Design a protein around this ligand. Sequence first.
Ligand SMILES: [Mg+2]
Ligand SMILES: [Mg+2]
Ligand SMILES: [Zn+2]
Ligand SMILES: [Zn+2]
Lengths: 476, 1336, 50
Amino acid sequence: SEIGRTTDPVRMYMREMGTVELLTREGEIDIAKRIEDGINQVQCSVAEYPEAITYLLEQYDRVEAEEARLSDLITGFVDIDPELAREKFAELRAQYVVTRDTIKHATAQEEILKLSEVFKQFRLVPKQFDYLVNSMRVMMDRVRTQERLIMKLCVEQCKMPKKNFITLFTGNETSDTWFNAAIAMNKPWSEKLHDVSEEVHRALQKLQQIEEETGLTIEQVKDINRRMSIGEAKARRAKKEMVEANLRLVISIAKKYTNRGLQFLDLIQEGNIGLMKAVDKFEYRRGYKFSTYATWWIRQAITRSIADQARTIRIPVHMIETINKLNRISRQMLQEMGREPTPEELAERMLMPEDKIRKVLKIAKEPISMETPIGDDEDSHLGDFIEDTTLELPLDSATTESLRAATHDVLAGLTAREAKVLRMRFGIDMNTDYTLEEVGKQFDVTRERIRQIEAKALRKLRHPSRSEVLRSFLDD
Amino acid sequence: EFDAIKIALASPDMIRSWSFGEVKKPETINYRTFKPERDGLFCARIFGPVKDYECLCGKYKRLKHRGVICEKCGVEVTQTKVRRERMGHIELASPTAHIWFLKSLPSRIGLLLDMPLRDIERVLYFESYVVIEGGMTNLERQQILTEEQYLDALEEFGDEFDAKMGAEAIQALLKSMDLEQECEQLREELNETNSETKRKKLTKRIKLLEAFVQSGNKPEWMILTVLPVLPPDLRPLVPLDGGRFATSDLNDLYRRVINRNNRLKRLLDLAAPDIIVRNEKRMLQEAVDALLDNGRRGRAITGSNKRPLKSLADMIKGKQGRFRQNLLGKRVDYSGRSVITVGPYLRLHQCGLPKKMALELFKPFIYGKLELRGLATTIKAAKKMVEREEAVVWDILDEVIREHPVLLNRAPTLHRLGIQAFEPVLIEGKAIQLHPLVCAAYNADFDGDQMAVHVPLTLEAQLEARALMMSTNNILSPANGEPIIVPSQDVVLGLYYMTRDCVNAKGEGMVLTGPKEAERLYRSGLASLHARVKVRITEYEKDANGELVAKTSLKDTTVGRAILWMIVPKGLPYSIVNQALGKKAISKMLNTCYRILGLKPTVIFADQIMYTGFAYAARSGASVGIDDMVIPEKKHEIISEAEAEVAEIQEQFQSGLVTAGERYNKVIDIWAAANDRVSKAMMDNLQTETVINRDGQEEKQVSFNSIYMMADSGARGSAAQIRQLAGMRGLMAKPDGSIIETPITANFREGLNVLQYFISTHGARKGLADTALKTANSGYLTRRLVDVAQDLVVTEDDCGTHEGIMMTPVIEGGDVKEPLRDRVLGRVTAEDVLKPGTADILVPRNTLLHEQWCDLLEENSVDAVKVRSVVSCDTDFGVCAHCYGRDLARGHIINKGEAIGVIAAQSIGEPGTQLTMSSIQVKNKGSIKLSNVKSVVNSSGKLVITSRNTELKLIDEFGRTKESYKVPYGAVLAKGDGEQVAGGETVANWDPHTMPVITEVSGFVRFTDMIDGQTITRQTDELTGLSSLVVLDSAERTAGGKDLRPALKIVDAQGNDVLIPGTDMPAQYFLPGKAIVQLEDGVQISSGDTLARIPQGGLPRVADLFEARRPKEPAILAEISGIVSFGKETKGKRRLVITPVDGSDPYEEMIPKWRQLNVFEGERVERGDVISDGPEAPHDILRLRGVHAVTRYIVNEVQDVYRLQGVKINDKHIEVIVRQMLRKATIVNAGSSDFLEGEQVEYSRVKIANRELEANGKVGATYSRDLLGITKASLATESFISAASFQETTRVLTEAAVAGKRDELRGLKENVIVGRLIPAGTGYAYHQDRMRRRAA
Amino acid sequence: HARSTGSYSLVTQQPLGGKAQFGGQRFGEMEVWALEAYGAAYTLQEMLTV
DNA sequence: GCCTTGACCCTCCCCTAAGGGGAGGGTTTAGATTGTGTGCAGTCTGACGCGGCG
RNA sequence: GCAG
DNA sequence: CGCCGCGTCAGACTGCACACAATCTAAACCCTCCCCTTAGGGGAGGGTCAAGGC
Ligand SMILES: [Mg+2]
Ligand SMILES: [Mg+2]
Ligand SMILES: [Zn+2]
Ligand SMILES: [Zn+2]
């Protein structure tokens, strides 16, 4: 189509963004219903893992003795007072204790779905719900890379048929009777394989703890993890359908922030991040349109990024808000008084001390480019008028070397002991100076004798016999 | 320390190895306490401590514990200067194409992947996909997919194939390619097809692939995955005095890169929808592309000014980049500046330096002597003493400047005499006092000019200022050899007034004992300075052994020439002052003293000339009054007659007999004649208006008018200005060049009225604006010439070559523009030049032809000398000293180590501000000579040439040529070959408005397929009375004889084929259209009569000669020697064939027919013959006629421009630039070598390769030498530092980077950039020591 | 104007520009060519380095 | 003179009780709003190279 | 804006 | 393969003086960490002062 005719990233963004038609009032409701359907689907899948609801039950047991409050674990109930939640946790507890004692296998496979759809009633907070899902995630991910290294324990031995190797591995999972038929195959590969049949043992039996740790076996929670992925990827592509359809809301908001130190695309990217938060935190059951909430989050993200990354030397958000308040107060006083308000009267229009306002006024200036043309000459820039102030003048370098030579003369006009006491007492010809105790430990002498030595040496160097070379280094 | 400089691509591991830590945050500094923030663009932990030996938290503060890393904040304890050296790095969340290798044409990523830049850009801007590998599918590698094609070919082919988009895809492509398999496949696809430009594209890509294989560069390093962060002390954030900060723009660009990178990492951790992550990847790509080169892709990023940000590439590129602002020239200590003022008491070697400037430029020297002499106990005491300006620091200062020269420099330093060393003389003013004779070299007048003083610090620099640059060493110009320290306006007027003669001047005719008696008489008032007297003059001749021998004779002189003789050095003739000395006579006097007696007496002579000219110019009181502009009294009569004539032409135009065109032309010509009559009357009335008495009788002499003495001395002005003072100031031109039909009849002594003054300003502002805008046009040419020739040094003494160019005096038509002596003075002969009587060697083979040898050559009549040139020099990397010839500025052969490239480029480019923006009549006697002699005798007994390259020269009775013209083909010559004529003897006659068909042999007319009606229109006019024919042109005839072309043949009255002499092939006249045939079939025509007739500068010229720019309508040349034939005509572009005698015949052309072809079918041609006519292209001259031919063409075509404006440049200086243009070669046959066919190599490389091949018997490569203009030859050096500091830094640096070049620092720009000695001059010995101690 | 030693520029360590900042004269590109045209290699090398 | 030796003495860093004051960072804001606009610059010509394109 |  | 459009690349050198840029918006909560308040105490680290003996 129009592809290839522009390189501007903002034209490309707008062109690619406009291919998504907006949502109606009932479109947002459908998409939010799909999102919550995905998250309750992953809820009802993880309810198949019973240690999850035991964790939530012992969390309520923590709420029993005020380890937490109720608002931290449950945000509501669909089918907020502590009145209902007591019988709610009784409902989940009664289902758990009736599901515990049953071991069978079609007899014990409806009780789990009863558990899941009694647990569906809980509108969990993101904290606990995230905790359970990433917990079961890391559990089967470690045992799953364990299964994957059981497979690639054959690749170190040989290259092997996996399509013949998948028919064996599943379902026994407590023994090597699936591995016993591998030598009934006896193609060359399955020679090498069996010699590592010992170092697979500690792998192939250790998931046998989880075979009784969750109460389930690995193929059941395998399908549970698969339906977990289906549910969360269902919610993820539904949040994406609500983010992509409100990308013009971001632009309508972000055009109001344009020249405040950020490029247009920086603003709409930060607004996009805020919009993704707004989608994550939207409740359609409040009966409000998506624009009313999403505007709050988009405004937050955009103004926060302007506060953070629009200035070269960054000032905090508290000082950003103080500067904004000062500028608004000042443009009101300028309109009233008909002139610029002096910081003294600006200190009574605001209610801050006057030197605080003076330093706030000193803060706000932005650094000048060192390439600004001076007088718009464009052959003379600001940066070539800036001198290096850290250098020392070569007259001062010549003076320092002359002073070193003079000090060497004067200190050679002393005895070795006094010259050593002075060369250690100050840092002369050394990398460090020393205390009286360190110089005394160098001479196995207590500190006051070193002090006396150094005093008499300073007395000698003060004389008119040795000090006319040195006194010339003190400017009169 | 280091022998070369290597550039290459940067691996991401190499970048992580430069860095001292990752820059994770855009935080520059804290705002309350301005300490640098952690992980920021200014970090004390990454980039080192902000104070000397001090931790940022202050826990470690002294250099006791140095190098320790404070565990509280990890800043090291070391010098803060490490913030100028320690880089950091930004780890990019997604890859990002380097814009220099993506966009700088030709795109290297496009050239590598064989993928067009629009498809690459559509892939990386996330518009299209590209299948990085297909597998067992119908999708090849580089095949781009749009969105929907990828979307469906997903589920048709599953996940078998892999396609991607973005710079991740381009990096996967660049990593997934095998370079040697690709280059070998390119070689086998090269050896298959002979398409020329396809073979050239393949060779471009082959050289790129093998450059990636030779160097360690991997292709995928053209895609950034780690970014380097410049050290913070080079992008400083500094507090200004007012509490405000000033920053570099790189802090903005780095800050933006970091922001978009961190937001990309957040979007990747949030798993944003892919629209958002693609937009952020496009924005990070944009931000890195704006950091590296701002404004190259699309729109520049402007920050906070709506003024674009200065990126990393803009720091190193352009007139404000590092290379030109900071490396090739820099601000310098021990330097001052002041207004220049005269001080004519000085000697030639000294300037006047104010004491107040010398006390400051020499401050460490004075501190040294103040402590050495015990006057100060301490350098601080000495600082206070020179601040108080105590009376002893003035004696110390007189001591420290004593033999210490200073460099004085006036900008523009157009040529090397713009910097000269003078010994200082301390003066009391504030203006530098510049000795007058040097001003002409500096181009200095004292109207506000200022000069800069520099102090040579070391002993070597003091001895170079004494020995190389002192102004008593620079008395000759490096361009022509002529003296450049030469008297001027006041001096020459004083010496001209002194050496003139009045008729009855006081004290005439007396006899004088010598010059001292003349001076006594003149100072007593007893003889005028112009009294013609008889004075006894003792003068010394240089004997043949070298010693001086006296002679004494009463000369007839004036008193003033006698007085002037007292300052003339000894070995000079008296005839050198016994004349009225103008500017040219004094310049020749100084040149004579230099060539006879040498430098040391010439310097004393020049100062004596200045003092005596100043003195006697003062004595004359030569003043300009208004009566000095004498207007001829015949001016009003001349102007009234011209007005009568133009009014007659006007009332004739009312009578309609003349068009407005010829009315205007005749009015202009009868005002131009009036202007010249007025100027002649004015000058004749002015130049001899002194008519004075001798013994009563009146007698006219040259005038003593002040205006005329100033014009005639050469002091100031010319007759062209005296014309406007006293004659009329003539016809003006409008701004568009067309001259106004009525002139300014008034001159500046009268008034210009208001209208004439307005008309005057029309052209005055045009001249001033031309002056203002052509200095930038000339300075750029000079820069291009210096950069094409900067690395040419005289490196040998003799290359032993025997070739050379044949120097002849240049003769344009009927006058010599330059004699042989001016073109061979100072060059070295290449063969024994022998007398016109053969076998008597006049001059041996390898002699420098100094003035003695040129006088010997002029005693004889030698007209051509084969002489050694630099284009013909065997030395690779340099030139030998014998092939160059004489040092123009010293007058001896040139020393080994001289940077003749910079001298040649400055000598060409310094005069560039003085430039802008029919039958044959023999003139005087001589034997007529012709070249390309093919003659026949016409019906009337004349000679008529059967050739088109015949030219008519005139040998003189001594054997030399004195004029040469070029005759058109078949011109009727009234005087035959080898005959004598006199002045005005018209020899060759023709008419330019038509071209004849010359009869081959005498015979009868017949028509070879010249069909009536198919090839002609029959016409009948009454003026001559005869019927005739016109041959049909292309668009006006039938099918048939437009294709089969009409011819006419020779048949006698018997019906037999008559032939041409020597060859019995059928002789035909193949006639093209638009020809007038007024002969009938069966008429008797003698050979030589017509059978049918068919009708028909400045500074940019120098620029587009040295730039080798192809002319718009190039003269087509004959490639191979053969016989012309024709292919498919009437196509819009015809086809021509040349048929050699013993070579492969078919050789085609695409000659467009809208230009008249200037040869005929039956005859032969050879290499270089002009088939068509037009301005010749130097590439064609080089390919067809040779190297020396394009050398002769370029030096003739540049000296043509410089000789209009009276500028004398030598030809060594143009031959040096030509040699540097003929620096590449193109391999045609690869030989037993490593060079590929058709690829362009350095010429010396292929020459030394052939030398070592033929040394071991093997066959060498054959090459065609190429002509590159000075820009394309400056950018095709073997050094990326020279070529990158010249211009187009981005192209040079990207090409050198992907090729992995290595700069061995051989020229002069690379050694000025790194702060080393240049390998030319006094730093030549050091570089030879360096290459004799490292190669062994 | 005259300057022996003085204040030096910040990024690149060369002398500062004008006689208001105690200056230092620009030894431009053309003057470097003028010293390369004589053989003044040592004068040039001290104009560049020291 | 060479040492010791106990007695003083200085500066500097941290501590007191019960919070005050501020800097500098996090977080949510639920009627509903869904495509950037400068009253921009655009105004430099000539040479050269390369690539779509008939 | 200016100086050469 | 020849041509037209488009992009890129240049365009003197020193000096003074002058002088940048100028519009462009949140609030109410909470948290931690740092430094401050009296009237001196407590102690490490490091000098200093008269005395005495070698
Ligand atoms: Mg002047
Ligand atoms: Mg200006
Ligand atoms: Zn620290
Ligand atoms: Zn030679």
